[PDB]
Amino acid sequence: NIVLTQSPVSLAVSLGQRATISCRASESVDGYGNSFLHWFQQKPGQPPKLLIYLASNLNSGVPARFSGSGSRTDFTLTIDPVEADDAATYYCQQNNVDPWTFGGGTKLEIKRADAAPTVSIFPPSSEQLTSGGASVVCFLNNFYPKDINVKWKIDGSERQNGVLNSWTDQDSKDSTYSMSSTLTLTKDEYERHNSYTCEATHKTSTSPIVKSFNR
Amino acid sequence: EVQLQESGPSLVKPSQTLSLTCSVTGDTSGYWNWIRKFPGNKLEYMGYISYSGSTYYNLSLRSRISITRDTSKNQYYLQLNSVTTEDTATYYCALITTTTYAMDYWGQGTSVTVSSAKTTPPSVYPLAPNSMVTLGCLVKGYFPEPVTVTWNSGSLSSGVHTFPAVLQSDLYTLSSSVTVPSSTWPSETVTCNVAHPASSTKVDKKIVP
Amino acid sequence: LINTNGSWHI
Numbered sequence: 001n002i003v004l005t006q007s008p009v010s011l012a013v014s015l016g017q018r019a020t021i022s023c024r025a026s027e028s029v030d031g032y033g034n035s036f037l038h039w040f041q042q043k044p045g046q047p048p049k050l051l052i053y054l055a056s057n058l059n060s061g062v063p064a065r066f067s068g069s070g071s072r073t074d075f076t077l078t079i080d081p082v083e084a085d086d087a088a089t090y091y092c093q094q095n096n097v098d099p100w101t102f103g104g105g106t107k108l109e110i111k112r113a114d115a116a117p118t119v120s121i122f123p124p125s126s127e128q129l130t131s132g133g134a135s136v137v138c139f140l141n142n143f144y145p146k147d148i149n150v151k152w153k154i155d156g157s158e159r160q161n162g163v164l165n166s167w168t169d170q171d172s173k174d175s176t177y178s179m180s181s182t183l184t185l186t187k188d189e190y191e192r193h194n195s196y197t198c199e200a201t202h203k204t205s206t207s208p209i210v211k212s213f214n215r
Numbered sequence: 216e217v218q219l220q221e222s223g224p225s226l227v228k229p230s231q232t233l234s235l236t237c238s239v240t241g242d243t244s245g246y247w248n249w250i251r252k253f254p255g256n257k258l259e260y261m262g263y264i265s266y267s268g269s270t271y272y273n274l275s276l277r278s279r280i281s282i283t284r285d286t287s288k289n290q291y292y293l294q295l296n297s298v299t300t301e302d303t304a305t306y307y308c309a310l311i312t313t314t315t316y317a318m319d320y321w322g323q324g325t326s327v328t329v330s331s332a333k334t335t336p337p338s339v340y341p342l343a344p345n346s347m348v349t350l351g352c353l354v355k356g357y358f359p360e361p362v363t364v365t366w367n368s369g370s371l372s373s374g375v376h377t378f379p380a381v382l383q384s385d386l387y388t389l390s391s392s393v394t395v396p397s398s399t400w401p402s403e404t405v406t407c408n409v410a411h412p413a414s415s416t417k418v419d420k421k422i423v424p
Numbered sequence: 425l426i427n428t429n430g431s432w433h434i
Contacts, residue, residue, distance in 0.1 A: 031431065032432065098429055099430070104427065125340040125342065128340045137353060175420075178392075269429065
């Protein structure tokens, strides 16, 4: 069957640059003097939103910054200029050949001035304990670039027996990322030690950002 | 301003039929579609029923799929038989008009999980702790996805990070952070709200110091 | 245009 190949899978652009995205059909998507190739933007928690329809008509309600072209088998999307709003995945979609398919998508990252994360660390609540259970949470908020590191010191010694981590997609307004290290043990395996630490080994400072508390 | 909205159970058992509904508000004109996004983010086109009653289904599903409409409840329907875990996805309904020949308008999508595990409501914990204070809510022990997290029933919306969930022990945990004026908390109360569709459960937890 | 089995025709 027909495959739509999008390239690149991800791509980083500065605030004001031009972004350029590629869609290639393995066989034509043309008919009656038209191209049934369509483009969408998708932010998380949101459905796809139409940008370009029929290859190069800009959808109503959509900023003239968006445009695309191509024909037959070779299609492209260009955003110009880029805004922070555009941190998102982008799909092409063909609806003139059985089976209808989407490209596997391209994710756009926006480049920005580096930023230190704001770290906060959190005791197991006195509810999680009352029911029997004990989680330590570390928030690593609003930092750039996306690369970060988090280690968990248990009285000055590294722990990997219950760490759970999670990154957010890029913020649409400030272009930062945020992260979330969680640590789960029982009411006891937690009362067996005292010193708890999460280590923010990010770029923006040459040494870690330590945050800590004691049970 | 046509609006579309998917509804149906968010949990289905292997080998059963998944049934979803799409209600249309704001207008026998065009093509009414179903589409899904896999947990790893790829989208697949499922099918339509046109204004004429005619259907078109992706041949990779044509044996298990059925899309119907009732033009006088202004509603249309997906039925997918003999489901397995590979059928887990956010389901969308969307319309195609001849104005564009494209999927112009889309529902918010609804999440469906094929699984034989039991619906488990979440436990929600306060994450109590400058110019700014960062608080939190831990949401532990629920199944299936999704959970929605707001703050002061929506009214307090900026400075919020709601983290993607994660699966352990057959169950999901997710955290959410909020940053406010140091001066007006604890002075002026902060409450995470938590809705778990599949158990139909709402928890508001107050974050006391 | 009208669509049969996923192709637009007249």
